[PDB]
Amino acid sequence: KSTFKSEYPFEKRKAESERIADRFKNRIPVICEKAEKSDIPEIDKRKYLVPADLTVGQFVYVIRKRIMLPPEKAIFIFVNDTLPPTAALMSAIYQEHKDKDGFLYVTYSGE
Amino acid sequence: SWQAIQ
């Protein structure tokens, strides 16, 4: 109902993402939210700790599973309002598009 | 809070 980012104070985020960068050597913190104008369901959880070696596509696979979104319906992940290549590694998108607060913000829609 | 992927 409210973009995670606007939901908490910077220091609260940078603190956590930093505590995350400590407790997990090869994991990645991802905030995954629904595009405002997409019909597809709103996920229950939006903070993920994705494995270093995980690809975009695979991560998509995970989101689909989370909303129980049927193979006919299409979904799309965006980063910085861009469509990362499905073959990419999440870590790479992170190191290249993370937020100043330490998280990699990702949105999904399909419609 | 956080959901870890395997």
Q: Find chain A residues with C-beta within 8 A of B2's C-beta.
A: 29, 45, 47-49
What range defines the domain where residue A64 resides?
1-111
- Contact assignment for B5 to A50 by CB distance below 8 Å: yes
A57 touches chain B (CB under 8 A): no
Cβ pair A51:B2 closer than 8 A: no
Q: Hunting for tokens 């996920």 — which residue is that?
A: A43
Are B5 and A54 an interchain contact pair (Cβ–Cβ within 8 Å)?
A: yes
Q: How many domains does chain A have?
A: 1
Measured in angstroms, the resolution is 3.0
State how far the alpha carbon of A70 is from the alpha carbons of A41, A55, A65, A66, A67, in Å.
11, 20, 9, 11, 9
Residues whose CB falls within 8 Å of the CB of residue B1, separated by 6 or more in sequence, listed in order: A47
Q: What is the CATH number of the domain that holds A85?
A: 3.10.20.90
Residues of B in contact with A62 (CB under 8 A): 5
Strand-pair category, A76-79 with B3-4? unpaired
List strands edge to edge, sheet with A76-79: A76-79, A104-109, A27-34, A47-51, B3-4
Contact A93, A104 (CB under 8 A): yes
The two tokens of residue A67 are 């909303």
Residues of chain B in contact with residue A54, where contact means CB-CB under 8 angstroms, are 5
For A31, phi then psi, to 5°, come to: -100, 115
The amino acid that residue A96 corresponds to is: E
Experimental determination technique: X-ray
